[PDB]
Structure formats: C-alpha cells, structure tokens
RNA sequence: CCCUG
RNA sequence: CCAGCAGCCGCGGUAAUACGGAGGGUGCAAGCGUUAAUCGGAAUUACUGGGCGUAAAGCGCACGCAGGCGGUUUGUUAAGUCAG
RNA sequence: AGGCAGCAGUGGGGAAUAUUGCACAAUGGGCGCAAGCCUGAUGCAGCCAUGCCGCGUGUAUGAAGAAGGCCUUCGGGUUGUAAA
C-alpha cells in the first residue's frame, strides 16, 4: 500500500464486534427464567448441562448455564447473569451468578466458594 | 431435577423410541488408549 | 471586575490560597486572569510563608483593580508594617 | 567456564510399515559469557542422547563476537527463513529484554542489557539462527575504524 | 498487612538463609534447610525460567519484609531515578527505616526492629518516626529513646551485631546508643546473592 | 507589512465580486506526504478587472457580504 | 520512466559493489558529484572522477578492506513519493553514529554529524551505514 | 457400488 | 463420558496431579476472584511497521482526463525547507 | 396554582451510586459607609473498601517432632516451632 493510496483511503480498522451483546456493555444484567431444561452437548463432551432460557429487563430473549452442583432455579425465578461463554453448549454465553436475587447457594462446598456464591462454613 | 429438552418436538407416537431418534441416547464414540484410534498429539499432563 | 483575591487550593483541613487577579463576577479558583503571588497559612518556621509580586499588584492597582481584605493585610505584612 | 543451556525439546514423528518411530530432538547454546557463543542441535531417538547431540554440536560450531562492556554497539536486525529480530543496546541495569530463546542465546552470549523484539514466526531454531545472524553481521567501532583508515576519535 | 507464618519454612522454600532468626543457634539444628516445604519436599523442581524470576523477587521480599504493592511502587520509584535501576531498588530497599535498624543493630531480626519501629523505640534527627518504610536520607542521624534504654532487648540485639559482620557505611554506638548513616551503599557493600537484574526483568515482564 | 494572500481567481462571470482558489502546501499529519490544498474564498473585486484563470492577490478586510470578506489587492499577472 | 537519479546512483553503487566491480559508470550532476565529494572525503568510495564536456560520466572506483564490502547497508530515504526533513535536534544516527546519513542542508550537502556542528537540518538523502 | 459415529 | 470444570488446548469410559472433598503448597492480602469495557501483546489495517506465482490478494487487455512523480545546465524568486 | 437537569430527599428505572446534617469559623459573591444580613457557593460532618496510600493482627523459645488428619512400599515422612 503506497502512501499517496493511503492518503486517497485511509486504514481501515476492525469493527471487533462484541462477544455477548445482550449485557449490553454492563457487567451483569437481570433476567426472569421463560424456561428451565437440560441440553446434551456437542462433541467430544457428552452430559447432561444445564440451561435456562432467560427474558432481560431490555427484552433480549438469551440462555444462560448454570453452573455447581444442581439449582433450584424455576419457573418465573428473578436470577442474575453475567457474561462468559460455554465451549461445549452450542449457543449459549451467559452464566447465572450463584447467590443471587433467587439463585441459591450451591450445597456443600467449601472450595470456590465466592464463585459459587457460598457463605463461610462456621468453624 | 431439570426437564429434558427433547428435540423431536411434539411426540404423538411413541416418546421412548423418540428419545432414542433424539441425540440424548445416541452412540458415543471412545478414545482408544492404543489401536486405532491410537495416536495422543499432546499428554494429558505434557 | 478586576480583584486581586485568594483562591482556596489545597486539601482537606489544609488549604493553600493563591493570590490571583481574577473577576469579581467569576467563581472562587474558577477563571481568573493571572496569578501575583501564593500564600500559604500553615507554613511552618524555616520556609517562605508568602510571596506577593508587589510590582504586579501595583500595575493592576493603577490600573483600576480592587483589593480584597486579606491580602491587603498579607500585603501590609510584607512591606512590614 | 563454558556456560552451556538447553532451549527447547521437541518430539519428531517417523512412519513406517508397523507404526510410528518417536524421535527427540533438542537444541542448546553455549557460551563463555564473554562474547564467544554458539549453538547446537541434535535428533536422538532419546532426549539426554540429543542433549549430548545439541551439546557437542554447539562446541564445534561455536563462534565468536564483539561487545561493549556487555551490550550491543548499535541497533541491529536479524532475518532467517520467517523469523525477523530487532535488538539494540541499553542502558546499565536494564537487563536483557527479549524472548524464550533470545533471552537464553544472549544471556549465554554474555550480552547483559539489551532490549530486543522478535516479528514474525516464533520457532526457536529460526529464532536462534536469526539472531546468530545479527551478532556475526553486528560489527564493532575499532574494526570499523581500521576498515576505515580513520582513527576511533575520528569515526567517534 | 504482613506475613504471619514460619519463617523457617520461608527460608526452606528459597533454600537459603535468609536471617529471619536470632542466630543463636544454626538454622541447620533449628530446621532442615536443604528440604523444600510441605509433603513434596523432596523433589527436586526442575524450575521454569519464569519460576526462577518469581523465586528471586519473592527471596528478596521475603529477606526485607516487603509487602508486593510496596516492592511493585519501590520498582516504579527506582526506573524512575537515574542509573541501574536494580542498585536503585536496593538502595531504597536498604533505605527503608526497619532495614536501618536491623543493620545498625538495634533490633535482633528485621521482625523484631520492625517491631520497635512500630512501638515507637527509634527517634530519627531528634523526631519521632515510627514507619518502617521510611526512608533515611544520607548523613541522618538517629536515636533510641529512654525506653528502650531500659529495655533489655537491645543488648541482646547489640551483642548479636558485634558477632555478626559490621556494614561499613553506618556508624553505630552502644555508650549512647545512638547511630549515623552517611551515605547510600552499593552492590559490593550488599549480599552477593541478590539476582536484581532478573528482578528488573520480571518486572518488564 | 499587512498579511495577505496569493491565489488563482478560476471565476468571476458574478459582478463586483470574484472566488479565488488559495493553493496551498500541506504536510499530510499521519503519512508525511506533502498534500497539495485548495481554498476558495469569495473576493471583492472592485471595477472587474479580473478575468477566468488569473492570479490575484487578496487581503482580508470587512464582511462586505454575506460570503464576501476579502477585497483586491492588485493582479499579479493578467492571464 | 526514470525518476530518481540519485537512487540509481545508490542502487548502482550497492549492486555493482555487491558483484565486487571496481569501479561504477553513471551520468553526472552537481547533486552527483557532491555526494561523491561526500564519500570520498568521510571514507566509503575510495576515488571518483568525472569525465566528458557535453556527457558528463561519473565513475567511482570503490575499495573492500577484508575482501568483503566495504558499504554494509546503504538506502535513499528522501524518496521523491515522501519527502524527508528534519529539525535541528532531529537529526537521526544512522548505525548509532558508525554509519552517517548524507543531509543536504542550506550550506550545501553534508554528513550528518557536519549538520550538526554547523546548526541546520534539511533532506535526508541517504542512509549509509 | 459401499464400509456406524 | 453421570455429576461436573472450562479463557484456549481439552479432562471425565472403575487406578482423574483437570470433576467434588481432605491434606499439603503457590500467589495476593483487607482485600481476593468473576463479569463488563479500552489499549497492549496484534508487525492481526503495517506512517514508523505487512503483503499479492502456488497460502487471501495484479483489473482480461489497452488508451487516457483530473491526480501523483520528474533527464541536465545557468540565472532568478524564496513558496515548501532550514536557522535565529 | 405548579415546575428538584440547585442541596438533602421520595417514587420509578437499573447490576449500581450516599444524610430530608452543622456553620458563615475561613475563602468568595450580593447589598450596605460600616457594623451587619443572605449565601444547600464554600468550609466541614454522616454513609459506601469505590480507588490510591499508610499502618495492625504481636516478639523470641520450644521435640513432646504432642496429638488428629495426609501418604505408606507401615520402616516411616508430612503438617511442624507449627501448637500447647
Ligand atoms: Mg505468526
Ligand atoms: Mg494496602
Ligand atoms: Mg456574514
Ligand atoms: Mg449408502
Ligand atoms: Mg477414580
Ligand atoms: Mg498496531
Ligand atoms: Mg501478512
Ligand atoms: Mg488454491
Ligand atoms: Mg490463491
Ligand atoms: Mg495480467
Ligand atoms: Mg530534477
Ligand atoms: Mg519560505
Ligand atoms: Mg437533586
Ligand atoms: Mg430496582
Ligand atoms: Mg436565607
């Protein structure tokens, strides 16, 4: 590219389009769950994840995973999402935060208890 | 307990043979350690 | 109108007024327009307190500006009166 | 008194009519630290065999160079096969800012406070032999000077 | 604010002594030196360049007392002076004023003049410091009140001092138990064992 | 001496006024190539003695139009 | 066509001193002849001379010290699609001041550090380092 | 002609 | 091959340093992780600083306006350029 | 009759952003000759780890190598001067 065609047209940058457009640059948005099911995933992985299809305060239509060992999370249940997506579930880049408005702790656990929203064991 | 999201739809048959036509119990494939599908690039631990 | 005045600088329990020629319908250390001198309140023994361009000052004083109290004193303290 | 260092380990792959011969190949640099340096690669079918391989070969094939009080004379570029460096010298203390395997050749070389870059493909053997290179075309004032038929105060 | 656990095991995973004790014993009779800390102690870690970086900067913290925001702002401080900036960072680190104190004598270990800077034990040019990251500027001289006068500790740590090596760019006094640093020191005047170019380098990392 | 202005005047068919094409000669800010740069500005031109494709020299004055703030100096060379 | 000859005068000095000729032929011009002057008395073209009234020929005999050549690198940077001009403090040291940049400043062409004794700036020329 | 993922 | 982890490569199939726990370490520290967003690494829009035979990339070929560049000498202007 | 995108605040929105505070003591403004009056500017206070910065959770001694866990080729090593 010579300088006098960079002069004539300038570089054109990328775009660099976002990767979860739905949070729509804020760090977690609030959803109620429309529906709570389970999805196998793609290969090679094959289990049984857990997912909810989630309508946001700003009417995106979304799935999000949830994450730990097992929920309690129902229909019409007001959750938290935060950004993050799932390699093996085609589709869905969101995760539910755990200690949330109505996303319960996860049972038992005494290791990545922030991240699994996890008050301390009284000891 | 989750529901799971069969992707047969709406079953008026038979929803066990469903299931079965659904990816949920389909035939996985595995990893031989050695023979044929033999070869690790990289270790598990390398 | 043209108001040698202190604005108030400084932090928290500790301020430092700068001696400013500055209209009088602005604001308190908003626009201004030129700086003649500092002084400094809570300086302590072994350090300049103050220091006022007394030649500047007069040059606006004859030239129609108004003085403000304080440093009228400051300047009464530094020709020592 | 001769300071010697592995880079990197790379396991090869053979085909033959049964399966698959796995070979190791691994590639060092040696050095005095005091301006005198090379490198040596070598391919056994086991990985302290290619050392003594990278080992005997960086002996032989080591070479020589010029610094200034450990560091470069002059910014300098070094281009083999797909790999480009750019490295220029600095100031005391700064310590020797470069990659992987620049950072082992140089701090092998004796090189102390360098700033350097690697552009381009990043394999360690081109990236040693690139910045081979750039030492042995890097050339040195009072060799200048002489190539000159000036004097150091005249060229400096 | 500081690190709260054994020393020892400290000074068993850089494998070195690093003066955290009294020294009236050998470190050697107190732990096993040699051994690294924990169930896999001994395996020997083939150590990554960068694990090799990381150990020397954490040696170093953890022979000062040095808490990481501290070392990261001290590093910023020496590329911003002039000259090598691995002597600059370890003129400030000995600069620090819990440092002054251990190398003048007045406390056994760094913890224990740490801990007398804290008590407020050390006037500084007649007025009263009690920080540990201050810094002492060439040609200062400083003081150990009454209180400690009568505190027995500083003779113990006074005796320590005499049995171990003198720095050479401070003057100490036990009569009036008093003392006067004059000038920065350089690498010579310091442990041959601080790596601070790769230090520099982890930083530029 | 008063700042004024050479210029190529390229059309002048409207009365008692002329645009002149100020030429001049840019350093590009971000590729360093010299970029030539044109500038028209609406000239007062008393009595029309200029003609298509002339070179004029103007000098900034009052606005005596709405486009109109510069006024004739004298003609460098008649075309 | 052509447009650059002070380019071919660099091109032909690196590519017949490349292939070990002793000495290069081009035409001539004020400009030519006073980058000649330049490197022959700062020490990379050993001789120059120029021959012929109406065609101007200039020929640069040119030395190699240990066989090898004696010019490393040598490039034109006031290229006539991007002119180059610098300030007095801009200046560049070409080769960390081994090699010099042939600068035509307003009291003639110079070397780079003659530039910077006398005061001025003007067209780099050319890097030879 | 084809060789379950 | 369930439960699950995941930023990438990927781990889980009855001998998991990758899941959950314990013990032990590592790194930070009144903070610590996660998410969001910008720059960097990215020489991955390359002015410094990229490329086009085969990896993406030479219009199918030519003429040609605007535009971009200009063999050589002398004199003149000093716009660019340089110095104060 | 009314116009908090003045200060504090309320409702709502949202993942989220504070007290319906004290004083003209200082700086500054308005008016006045001045005393003086007004000043939700300003000076301060209250809440929030929101960020940066500074300090604290102590100092030496202690094999009894205590237990109880962790591994075990059951010899032992580890937690461990760690603890009391
Ligand atoms: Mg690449
Ligand atoms: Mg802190
Ligand atoms: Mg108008
Ligand atoms: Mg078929
Ligand atoms: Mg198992
Ligand atoms: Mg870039
Ligand atoms: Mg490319
Ligand atoms: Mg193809
Ligand atoms: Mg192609
Ligand atoms: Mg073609
Ligand atoms: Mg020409
Ligand atoms: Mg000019
Ligand atoms: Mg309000
Ligand atoms: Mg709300
Ligand atoms: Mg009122």
Redesign the interface.
């Known amino acids: 590219a010579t300088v006098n065609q960079l002069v004539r047209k300038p570089r054109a940058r990328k775009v660099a389009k976002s990767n979860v457009p739905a949070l729509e640059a804020c760090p977690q948005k609030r959803g109620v769950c429309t529906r ?5 995933p793609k ?2 992985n ?1 289990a ?1 994840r ?1 997912v909810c299809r989630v309508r946001l305060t700003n009417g995106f239509e979304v799935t999000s995973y949830i994450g730990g060992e097992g ?1 309690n999370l129902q229909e019409h249940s007001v959750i938290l999402i935060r950004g993050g997506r799932v390699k093996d579930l085609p589709g869905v880049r969101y995760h539910t935060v755990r200690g949330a408005l109505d996303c319960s702790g996860v049972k038992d656990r005494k290791q990545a208890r922030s991240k699994y929203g996890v008050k301390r064991p009284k000891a | 307990m ?4 069969h992707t047969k739809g709406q079953i008026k048959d038979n929803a066990i043979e469903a299931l079965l036509h659904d ?2 119990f ?1 035939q ?2 595995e ?1 031989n350690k050695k023979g044929k599908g033999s ?1 690790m690039r990289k270790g598990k631990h390398g | 109108m043209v108001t040698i005045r202190l604005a108030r600088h400084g932090a928290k329990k500790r301020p430092f007024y700068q001696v400013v020629v500055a209209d009088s319908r602005n604001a308190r250390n908003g626009r201004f327009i030129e700086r003649v001198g500092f002084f400094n309140p809570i300086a302590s023994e072994k350090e300049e307190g103050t220091r006022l361009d007394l030649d500047r000052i007069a040059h606006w004083v004859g030239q129609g500006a108004t003085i403000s109290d304080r440093v009228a004193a400051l300047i009464k303290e530094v020709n020592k009166a | 008194e001769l300071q010697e260092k592995l880079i990197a380990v790379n396991r090869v792959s053979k085909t033959v009519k049964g399966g ?1 011969i796995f070979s190791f190949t691994a590639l060092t640099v040696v050095g005095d630290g005091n301006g005198r340096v090379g490198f040596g690669y070598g391919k056994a079918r086991e990985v302290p065999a290619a050392i003594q391989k990278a080992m005997e070969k960086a002996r032989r094939n080591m070479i020589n160079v010029a610094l200034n009080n450990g560091t470069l004379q002059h910014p300098v570029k070094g281009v083999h096969t797909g790999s480009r460096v750019f490295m220029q010298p600095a100031s005391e203390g700064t310590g020797i800012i470069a990659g992987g395997a620049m950072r082992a050749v140089l701090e092998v070389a004796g090189v102390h406070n360098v700033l350097a870059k690697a552009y381009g493909s990043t394999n360690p053997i081109n990236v040693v032999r690139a910045t081979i290179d750039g030492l042995e075309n890097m050339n040195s004032p009072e060799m200048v000077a002489a190539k000159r038929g000036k004097s150091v105060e005249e060229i400096l | 604010a500081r690190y709260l656990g054994p020393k020892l095991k400290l000074s068993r995973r850089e494998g070195t002594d690093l003066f955290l004790k009294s020294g009236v014993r050998a470190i050697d009779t107190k732990c096993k030196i040699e051994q690294a800390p924990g169930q896999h102690g001994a395996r020997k870690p083939r150590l990554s360049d960068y694990g090799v970086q990381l150990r020397e900067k954490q040696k170093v913290r953890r022979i000062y007392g040095v808490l990481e925001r501290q070392f990261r702002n001290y590093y910023k401080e020496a590329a911003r002076l002039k000259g090598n900036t691995g002597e600059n960072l370890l003129a400030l680190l000995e600069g620090r004023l819990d440092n002054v104190v251990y190398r003048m004598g007045f406390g056994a270990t760094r913890a224990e003049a740490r801990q007398l800077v804290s008590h407020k034990a050390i006037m500084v040019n007649g007025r009263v410091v009690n920080i540990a990251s201050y810094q002492v500027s060439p040609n200062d001289v400083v003081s150990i009140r009454e209180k400690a006068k009568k505190q027995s500790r500083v003779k113990a740590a006074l005796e320590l001092a005499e049995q171990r090596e003198k720095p050479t760019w401070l003057e100490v006094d036990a009569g009036k138990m008093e003392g006067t640093f004059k000038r920065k020191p350089e690498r010579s005047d310091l442990s041959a064992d601080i790596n601070e170019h790769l230090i520099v380098e982890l930083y530029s990392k | 001496k008063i700042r004024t202005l050479q210029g190529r005047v390229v059309s002048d068919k409207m009365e008692k006024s002329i645009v002149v094409a100020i030429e001049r000669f840019v350093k590009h800010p971000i590729y360093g190539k010299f970029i030539k740069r044109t500038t028209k500005l609406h000239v007062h031109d008393e009595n029309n003695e200029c003609g298509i494709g002339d070179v004029v020299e103007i000098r900034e004055c009052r606005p005596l139009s709405k486009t109109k703030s510069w006024t004739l100096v004298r003609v460098v060379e008649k075309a | 066509s052509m447009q650059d000859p002070i380019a071919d005068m660099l091109t032909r000095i690196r590519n017949g001193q490349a292939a070990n000729k002793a000495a290069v032929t081009m035409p001539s011009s004020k400009l030519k002849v006073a980058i000649a002057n330049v490197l022959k008395e700062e020490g990379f073209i050993e001789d120059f001379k120029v021959e012929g009234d109406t065609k101007p020929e200039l020929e640069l005999t040119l030395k190699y010290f240990q066989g090898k050549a004696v010019v490393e690198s040598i490039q034109r940077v006031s290229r006539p699609g991007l002119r180059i001009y610098k300030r007095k403090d801009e200046l560049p040291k070409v080769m960390a001041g081994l090699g010099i940049a042939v600068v035509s400043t307003s009291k003639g062409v110079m070397t780079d550090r003659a530039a910077r004794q006398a005061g001025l700036g003007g067209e780099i020329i050319c890097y030879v380092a």
């Not at chain 1, 709570?36 to 196998?40: I, R």
């Open positions: 709570v099911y389970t999805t196998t290969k090679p094959s049984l857990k929920h | 989750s529901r799971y999201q990816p949920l389909r996985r494939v990893k070869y | 698959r």
